[PDB]
């Protein structure tokens, strides 16, 4: 359920998503949009960006 | 096999030489007199009917007096039956004493539990009481919800509700035989047995031991 | 809670089938006065089992 901007109302939908990378353990969650598919897409972009940062930090060592 | 009918006298303690205190129940098992022996031909099953105690002559009805007259025994306070195991035979008028339990190690005691009357759900089924504060309104020991909004839209059979508690047949199994006093017609068993003082108890050899 | 349909006179009579009174089976007769009275109760004149228990 969308805890932010709608977590108060009696009727709550499973629009909020949380994508957790199984190997690394990095958690990512999006609740901005009312559609779970759009929230999944946004979380996918953020999680992939974080993984991009991980490889960059490996180079930055 | 078969058992005996006795009376609940009370509870006491037995001190052993090693300091262990054993809570025991005193059961008065006097002579049980056989009134009728049933066979597979006339009755279809093998059992014996026994009586114990004494009853007033002015209160023993004529049909009961005739039944005891045919048996040849004196009238008792009731009639009970015990199923006969294979290779076990008794005769009408034979008297069975508490010595039957001389070699019996564990017994099962059957009696009528003390009647609690109409009891609530909390007492009868160990239901949890609701909140006594925080705004509760007239609902402290109430049962609560008893079904669903629909499907089935009804209350299932066997729902745990309030009603009569106690005054029913209760059996306690595997009670150790502390002592068999043949001289005093006593049976001492470890633990507590259902019922109050003076109630009629049925003691049989243990089946699960 | 209230009814959804009007109960009938048939159901009303069935409910009242257990509301009938029971008359006294018999009345004891005193051995001295001869008056009728409830058993284990003194008579109107004040006699119980052949003795004037209360003086008027």
């Amino acid at each position: 359920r969308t805890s932010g901007a709608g977590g108060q109302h009696v009727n709550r939908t499973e629009s909020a998503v949380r994508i957790t990378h199984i190997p690394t353990g990095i958690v990512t969650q999006c609740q901005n949009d009312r559609s779970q598919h759009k929230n999944k897409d946004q979380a996918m972009k953020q999680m992939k960006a974080k993984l991009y940062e991980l490889e960059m930090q490996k180079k930055n060592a | 096999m078969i058992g005996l009918v006795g009376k609940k006298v009370g509870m006491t303690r037995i001190f052993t030489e090693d300091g262990v205190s054993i809570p025991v129940t005193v059961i008065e098992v006097e002579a049980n007199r056989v009134t009728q022996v049933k066979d597979l031909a006339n009755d279809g099953y093998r059992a014996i009917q026994v009586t114990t105690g004494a009853k007033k002559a002015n209160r023993v009805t004529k049909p009961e007096a005739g039944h005891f007259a045919k048996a040849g025994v004196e009238a008792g306070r009731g009639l009970w039956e015990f199923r006969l195991a294979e290779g076990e035979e008794f005769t009408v008028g034979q008297s069975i004493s508490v010595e039957l339990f001389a070699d019996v190690k564990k017994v099962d005691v059957t009696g009528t539990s003390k009647g609690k009357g109409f009891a609530g759900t909390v007492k009868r089924w160990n239901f949890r009481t609701q909140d006594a504060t925080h705004g509760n309104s007239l609902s402290h020991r109430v049962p609560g919800s008893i079904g669903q909004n629909q499907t089935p839209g009804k209350v299932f059979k066997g729902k745990k509700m309030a009603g009569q508690m106690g005054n029913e047949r209760v059996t306690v199994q595997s009670l150790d035989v502390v002592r068999v006093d043949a001289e005093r017609n006593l049976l001492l068993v470890k633990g507590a047995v259902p019922g109050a003082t003076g109630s009629d108890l049925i003691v049989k050899p243990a089946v699960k031991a | 809670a209230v009814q959804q349909n009007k109960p009938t006179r048939s159901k009303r009579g069935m409910r009242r089938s257990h509301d009938a009174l029971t008359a006294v089976t018999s009345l004891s007769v005193d051995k001295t006065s001869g008056e009728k009275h409830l058993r284990h109760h003194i008579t109107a004149d004040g006699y119980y089992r052949g003795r004037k228990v209360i003086a008027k």
Partner: protein, 114 residues
């Protein structure tokens, strides 16, 4: 009634000394520690007595190693071996539960001389 009376009176000790609440008594008990069997002493003030024939019991309070310990002895239990009244106390109650909140000069009990 009579049956239980006989069964209980045939197990009661006949060497029980007479003691009253407030009397300092010493009780010998069988430890049965391991294989050996020895007697351990427990001396303290009697604070409560329950007289129920065979089911009689008495409570003794003792300050041991800075800690207050209360022990309830069954009078006719075989584990209890001997009771000795070392001192007699002067009290006006059958129960002395007010001694549980007093220590030192406030827990002293006057001796019953006569």
């Amino acid at each position: 009634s009579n049956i239980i009376k006989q069964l209980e009176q045939e197990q009661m000790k006949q060497d029980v000394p007479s003691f009253r609440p407030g009397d300092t008594v010493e009780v010998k008990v069988w430890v049965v520690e391991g294989s050996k069997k020895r007697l351990q002493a427990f001396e303290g003030v009697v604070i409560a007595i329950r007289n129920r024939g065979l089911h009689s019991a008495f409570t003794v309070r003792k300050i041991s190693n800075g800690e207050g310990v209360e022990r309830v002895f069954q009078t006719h239990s075989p584990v209890v071996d001997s009771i000795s009244v070392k001192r007699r106390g002067a009290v006006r109650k059958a129960k002395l539960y007010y001694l549980r909140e007093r220590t030192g000069k406030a827990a002293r009990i006057k001796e019953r001389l006569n």
